[PDB]
Design an enzyme around this catalytic site. Structure first.
Site, PDB file in Angstrom:
ATOM      1  N   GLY D  14       0.720  -1.244   0.000  1.00 38.68           N
ATOM      2  CA  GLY D  14       0.000   0.000   0.000  1.00 38.68           C
ATOM      3  C   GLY D  14       0.752   1.300   0.000  1.00 38.68           C
ATOM      4  N   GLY D  16       2.477   2.004  -3.344  1.00 38.20           N
ATOM      5  CA  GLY D  16       2.354   2.161  -4.770  1.00 38.20           C
ATOM      6  C   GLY D  16       1.110   2.805  -5.371  1.00 38.20           C
ATOM      7  CE1 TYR D 157       1.337  -9.490 -12.840  1.00 30.83           C
ATOM      8  CE2 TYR D 157      -0.285  -9.737 -14.634  1.00 30.83           C
ATOM      9  CZ  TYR D 157       0.138  -9.152 -13.433  1.00 30.83           C
ATOM     10  OH  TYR D 157      -0.626  -8.204 -12.815  1.00 30.83           O
ATOM     11  CE  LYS D 161      -0.297 -10.641  -8.673  1.00 28.18           C
ATOM     12  NZ  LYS D 161      -0.703 -10.394  -7.292  1.00 28.18           N
ATOM     13  CB  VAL D 190      -5.695   0.017 -12.275  1.00 26.09           C
ATOM     14  CG1 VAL D 190      -5.944   1.058 -11.182  1.00 26.09           C
ATOM     15  CG2 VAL D 190      -6.802  -1.013 -12.223  1.00 26.09           C
TER      16      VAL D 190
HETATM   17  N1  LIG Z   1      -2.947  -1.786 -13.874  1.00 24.69           N
HETATM   18  C1  LIG Z   1      -2.965  -2.234 -12.619  1.00 24.69           C
HETATM   19  O1  LIG Z   1      -2.874  -1.506 -11.633  1.00 24.69           O
HETATM   20  C2  LIG Z   1      -3.131  -3.742 -12.443  1.00 24.69           C
HETATM   21  C3  LIG Z   1      -3.731  -4.538 -13.422  1.00 24.69           C
HETATM   22  C4  LIG Z   1      -4.049  -5.869 -13.143  1.00 24.69           C
HETATM   23  C5  LIG Z   1      -3.735  -6.418 -11.889  1.00 24.69           C
HETATM   24  N2  LIG Z   1      -3.081  -5.644 -10.897  1.00 24.69           N
HETATM   25  C6  LIG Z   1      -2.562  -6.264  -9.630  1.00 24.69           C
HETATM   26  O2  LIG Z   1      -2.426  -5.295  -8.565  1.00 24.69           O
HETATM   27  C7  LIG Z   1      -1.190  -5.526  -7.847  1.00 24.69           C
HETATM   28  C8  LIG Z   1      -0.133  -4.459  -8.118  1.00 24.69           C
HETATM   29  O3  LIG Z   1      -0.413  -3.226  -7.447  1.00 24.69           O
HETATM   30  P1  LIG Z   1      -0.423  -1.886  -8.334  1.00 24.69           P
HETATM   31  O4  LIG Z   1      -0.966  -0.757  -7.545  1.00 24.69           O
HETATM   32  O5  LIG Z   1      -0.996  -2.133  -9.670  1.00 24.69           O
HETATM   33  O6  LIG Z   1       1.148  -1.670  -8.571  1.00 24.69           O
HETATM   34  P2  LIG Z   1       2.389  -1.128  -7.702  1.00 24.69           P
HETATM   35  O7  LIG Z   1       2.499   0.348  -7.812  1.00 24.69           O
HETATM   36  O8  LIG Z   1       3.518  -1.981  -8.152  1.00 24.69           O
HETATM   37  O9  LIG Z   1       1.932  -1.451  -6.171  1.00 24.69           O
HETATM   38  C9  LIG Z   1       2.361  -2.658  -5.501  1.00 24.69           C
HETATM   39  C10 LIG Z   1       3.501  -2.484  -4.484  1.00 24.69           C
HETATM   40  O10 LIG Z   1       4.214  -3.731  -4.369  1.00 24.69           O
HETATM   41  C11 LIG Z   1       5.514  -3.335  -3.935  1.00 24.69           C
HETATM   42  N3  LIG Z   1       6.439  -4.465  -3.728  1.00 24.69           N
HETATM   43  C12 LIG Z   1       7.060  -5.202  -4.664  1.00 24.69           C
HETATM   44  N4  LIG Z   1       7.702  -6.231  -4.094  1.00 24.69           N
HETATM   45  C13 LIG Z   1       7.457  -6.095  -2.793  1.00 24.69           C
HETATM   46  C14 LIG Z   1       7.832  -6.992  -1.803  1.00 24.69           C
HETATM   47  N5  LIG Z   1       8.522  -8.092  -2.085  1.00 24.69           N
HETATM   48  N6  LIG Z   1       7.383  -6.735  -0.555  1.00 24.69           N
HETATM   49  C15 LIG Z   1       6.622  -5.670  -0.289  1.00 24.69           C
HETATM   50  N7  LIG Z   1       6.264  -4.809  -1.247  1.00 24.69           N
HETATM   51  C16 LIG Z   1       6.665  -5.004  -2.527  1.00 24.69           C
HETATM   52  C17 LIG Z   1       5.863  -2.272  -4.943  1.00 24.69           C
HETATM   53  O11 LIG Z   1       6.994  -1.467  -4.593  1.00 24.69           O
HETATM   54  C18 LIG Z   1       4.585  -1.455  -4.832  1.00 24.69           C
HETATM   55  O12 LIG Z   1       4.700  -0.458  -3.802  1.00 24.69           O
HETATM   56  C19 LIG Z   1      -0.664  -6.860  -8.324  1.00 24.69           C
HETATM   57  O13 LIG Z   1      -1.102  -7.950  -7.495  1.00 24.69           O
HETATM   58  C20 LIG Z   1      -1.178  -6.900  -9.739  1.00 24.69           C
HETATM   59  O14 LIG Z   1      -1.209  -8.277 -10.094  1.00 24.69           O
HETATM   60  C21 LIG Z   1      -2.811  -4.293 -11.203  1.00 24.69           C
END
Ligand SMILES: NC(=O)c1ccc[n+]([C@@H]2O[C@H](COP(=O)([O-])OP(=O)([O-])OC[C@H]3O[C@@H](n4cnc5c(N)[nH+]cnc54)[C@H](O)[C@@H]3O)[C@@H](O)[C@H]2O)c1
Ligand SMILES: NC(=O)c1ccc[n+]([C@@H]2O[C@H](COP(=O)([O-])OP(=O)([O-])OC[C@H]3O[C@@H](n4cnc5c(N)[nH+]cnc54)[C@H](O)[C@@H]3O)[C@@H](O)[C@H]2O)c1
Ligand SMILES: NC(=O)c1ccc[n+]([C@@H]2O[C@H](COP(=O)([O-])OP(=O)([O-])OC[C@H]3O[C@@H](n4cnc5c(N)[nH+]cnc54)[C@H](O)[C@@H]3O)[C@@H](O)[C@H]2O)c1
Ligand SMILES: NC(=O)c1ccc[n+]([C@@H]2O[C@H](COP(=O)([O-])OP(=O)([O-])OC[C@H]3O[C@@H](n4cnc5c(N)[nH+]cnc54)[C@H](O)[C@@H]3O)[C@@H](O)[C@H]2O)c1
EC number: 1.1.1.331
Lengths: 267, 267, 267, 267
Positions: D14, D16, D157, D161, D190
């Site tokens: 939480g 990102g 991926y 997933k 997203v």
């Molecule tokens: N477009 C989208 O946003 C999209 C689409 C489809 C699915 N998802 C899913 O949503 C999730 C990703 O989140 P998000 O907001 O899209 O992206 P994001 O901005 O990457 O947020 C996720 C967070 O995970 C963090 N992170 C990576 N590795 C670690 C770790 N080992 N330990 C703790 N934190 C870590 C990363 O730094 C980030 O703060 C994933 O499970 C995706 O499979 C997102």
């Protein structure tokens, strides 16, 4: 060799297209077939030319009816002393648009009659002859719209070739505690012989469109290709798989390049 | 006849159980096999007794490894000039409990290695030889836990034979735009020859329990029964079905009599 | 707070059971409801006691009919100036056995009429008023037999609450290119108030059987529990999920302890 | 009102994007959150600006690790006396191509570690604190590639997933006989705030491409839109739905206009 040799089979739609190459395959693999359509003058110029009737006979049937499905089944037992396999094809598609709002009210009744509550009877008259012998696969034939959708395919064909997986998962949970298998095959665009009724359709210019659209560039679908999926499930080599909805899309159903072939890369 | 005659196939686990009756079927149906296991002293007393090596040879392979999957593939091209089929069985199950809380941390690493990120390489070294020829089905082997669950089966085997449908739907969406098929078979309780390690298991008293529990009383599963599902998908008669996860449960996966065989009726 | 406040909703079955606690929730969350059943003397002793009619009114409707679904929709626009939500419950179950062979021919017609080709019209008269405004979720209500099966549930209810996911995936692919959502909820054993017609049923001794059978010991299902799933999908907080078939089984649908609770362990 | 007021929640990602609007929603709806990321300088300039730490705190966690997931969970029990909800986001995507053949060998290990065998621990340390109290929903977060595919998305991926539905159907069949729910949310394109690393990506010109490609023209996805799907499943109003893989595609996943938008009609 003649693979499912011994079997007595019934196609409930083997005049038209999938149904007669599936018929010709089953009579090549040593079964004895009873083609069974309303299209009287094609269903016996299919049964008159495939083979000689001891192995291939025709019977007017109208699955929209119970006295009709009663007699097809009762005269197979009488032509040939049993019913191992009941391939139940039968299928109809809308003769009204697509659009919920301006696409009607009574080509839902009629195209539920031929497809869902007419696929049933086939399975009730086969069931009542396979259950006495504790052997038999009831194959049906649905479409990839058993799984999913399209902005083409009508909300009724989406709806009736969905439930032909209803009473094929459920028909399964009882005709199964008898060592009777319940599966359906489930294809994608297949059969030409150069169409039309509104132009677009003038088929081959349907089949050409089934290659720029597929997820398996290399070949084209056919009926031998669904016949494939159906002798498998029929009798031999089907012997413990009563699961299936053998989706024969060449993979297609499990993507959507709306966002990949918009995403692309460089230009 | 010898059905998929011409084919060169590779089983990545054909010493043990499913893998050698699937092997013996493929060499009965005229293929040339290369069994390929780490279990050195069973995998060649399987390849020494099935047939004579021009058609049946052994190769130590350890799918947990890339230099190992590299050489199996590269010496099939060299034993026999090609690779039409790659049946990729391989599978391992937990040697820790079930329970999330007291079931560990590192028989997730190791039983992801043999099952998911070791099913991959098999498909990367087959892929890199099938793509040059624009022909080939990569069959795998998952379990009915590819679909669903159990209070038995570990959260890791539920998890790794789930993703062996991952890179088998996705592996599909690209090895498919090459006329290369990607499917997996997906069985239920199969192989005896009278077990034990904790008692219960002393197999046949596993197979007997696969009949009071099934949804197809009449027969019993076997390996010839999965071999069935795998020559189908392998080469011939598979030619436009790259869909499938041919679930061979005799229907089982699609019920739950927790509430029916509690509901019952009269007593 | 009153969560989906502003909304005008129509339940097409809110006299009986799920339908009036879903109604009472929507009028608690600030909607204006129009309950809409044939059961005339319960559907207004539900609308007479829930609230005061500016927010809760009754309308005899018979979904087996088009002039009837026409007027419910046309008088909602006239009671209240619009139709945001159309919860389309409606559902009937067999009054013939189960067994394919001795379970009949015409409680397939009638229990396809009330369930599939009567769930349609609800969606055609809602569709033709939501499309003019480019807003609206059409929720339906299926059962876990939309997904799967039972040796209890009839091959017809298995078949018609299957297709209520037909025209809810397909209805979706067009009423969606309008920013109109299409989902269905999909429950498990729910509503008492102490039954009977054949004994077994004397409900609570149905609900007690929905706890020794579930996969979530701790609670019991109810109607507030499906109402939950339906305000979610209705209007607010549903705003980009037109996917769903929100299966509310407490997990149940994805196991089968036929072989685990035969496998067991020690005795 | 503050809807799931009382709850103590943990986001395992939480800082990102999805993760902090899901956080800000849960702290709007009266929970107390513990954001939990490795990205140290964003995860507390998110926890420093959302609210004041009694309700919002940060904790360096690295799910690729067990001593790390041990301490996040053990200091939530110590910050706040319990753990009702564990939203387990976390997710990583390939930093190698797509193509089986030229896309490597070790960004399968590492992007299985962060996604599958690192989603696990989150559920083992939440499980070991929720089981003592017999209450709790473990929500995860997968993608529409939990269901299906793309010629974009990597085979890894697609594979990891997928299994985050493995141990979310199976994790379900045991953390469920405790009145503990196991679900995952499952989104589509997203989160912007105007990207790039290879150009194409310069986001909004990603979001614009998520509208010419969707099956719900009218709106655009966001994070409030996944947060929606996650407070639902979290605690309140989730109380008997441990089924779900709440697919939030605006319908997309269930079509393929390769053949419709090739079929077209007139020109
Ligand atoms: N477009 C989208 O946003 C999209 C689409 C489809 C699915 N998802 C899913 O949503 C999730 C990703 O989140 P998000 O907001 O899209 O992206 P994001 O901005 O990457 O947020 C996720 C967070 O995970 C963090 N992170 C990576 N590795 C670690 C770790 N080992 N330990 C703790 N934190 C870590 C990363 O730094 C980030 O703060 C994933 O499970 C995706 O499979 C997102
Ligand atoms: N492109 C394709 O071929 C395609 C694609 C997807 C699915 N399918 C399925 O395959 C089946 C259709 O067969 P087909 O070869 O494509 O088309 P077809 O040529 O229409 O063959 C089917 C036969 O059904 C016949 N028929 C219609 N109503 C009755 C009736 N009530 N009683 C007896 N016979 C009747 C019809 O005259 C025809 O001979 C259906 O179940 C479709 O859902 C076909
Ligand atoms: N009851 C059943 O037979 C059953 C049930 C459901 C699914 N399956 C699946 O079938 C496969 C298992 O085969 P089987 O005949 O049941 O069992 P098996 O006897 O274990 O055969 C598989 C072979 O894999 C071998 N092996 C293990 N690791 C390696 C490795 N890293 N490299 C090369 N070889 C190795 C092992 O020694 C054995 O010879 C798995 O994919 C299962 O998921 C089997
Ligand atoms: N145990 C359960 O409650 C259960 C389980 C699984 C699924 N469902 C589904 O929930 C719905 C049934 O509702 P319920 O509360 O369980 O039962 P219910 O008490 O039968 O409520 C439904 C209402 O439908 C009414 N009705 C029947 N035909 C018509 C008609 N043609 N036009 C208008 N109204 C009519 C009927 O009188 C009743 O008032 C169905 O869609 C089921 O498939 C319920």
């Amino acid at each position: 060799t003649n693979r499912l040799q011994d079997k007595v089979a019934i196609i409930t739609g083997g005049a038209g297209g999938i149904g007669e190459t599936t018929a010709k395959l089953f009579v090549r693999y040593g079964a004895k077939v009873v083609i069974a359509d309303i299209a009287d003058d094609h269903g016996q110029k299919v049964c008159n030319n495939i083979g000689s009737p001891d192995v291939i006979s025709f019977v007017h049937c109208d699955v929209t009816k119970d006295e009709d499905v009663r007699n097809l089944v009762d005269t197979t037992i009488a032509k040939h002393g049993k019913l191992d396999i009941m391939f139940g094809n039968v299928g109809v598609l809308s003769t009204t648009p697509y659009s919920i709002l301006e696409a009607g009210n009574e080509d839902f009744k009629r195209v539920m009659d031929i497809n869902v509550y007419g696929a049933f009877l086939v399975a009730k008259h086969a069931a009542r002859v396979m259950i006495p012998a504790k052997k038999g696969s009831i194959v049906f034939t649905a479409s990839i719209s058993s799984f999913t959708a399209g902005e083409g395919v009508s909300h009724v064909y989406t709806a009736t070739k969905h439930a032909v997986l209803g009473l094929t998962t459920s028909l399964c949970t009882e005709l199964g505690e008898y060592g009777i298998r319940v599966n359906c095959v489930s294809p994608y665009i297949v059969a030409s012989p150069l169409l039309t009724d509104v132009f677009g359709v003038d088929s081959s210019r349907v089949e050409e469109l089934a290659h720029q659209a597929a997820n398996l560039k290399g070949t084209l679908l056919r009926a031998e290709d669904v016949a494939d999926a159906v002798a498998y499930l029929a009798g031999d080599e089907s012997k413990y798989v009563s699961g299936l909805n053998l989706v024969i899309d060449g993979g297609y159903t499990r993507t959507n390049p709306a966002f990949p072939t918009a995403l692309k890369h460089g230009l």
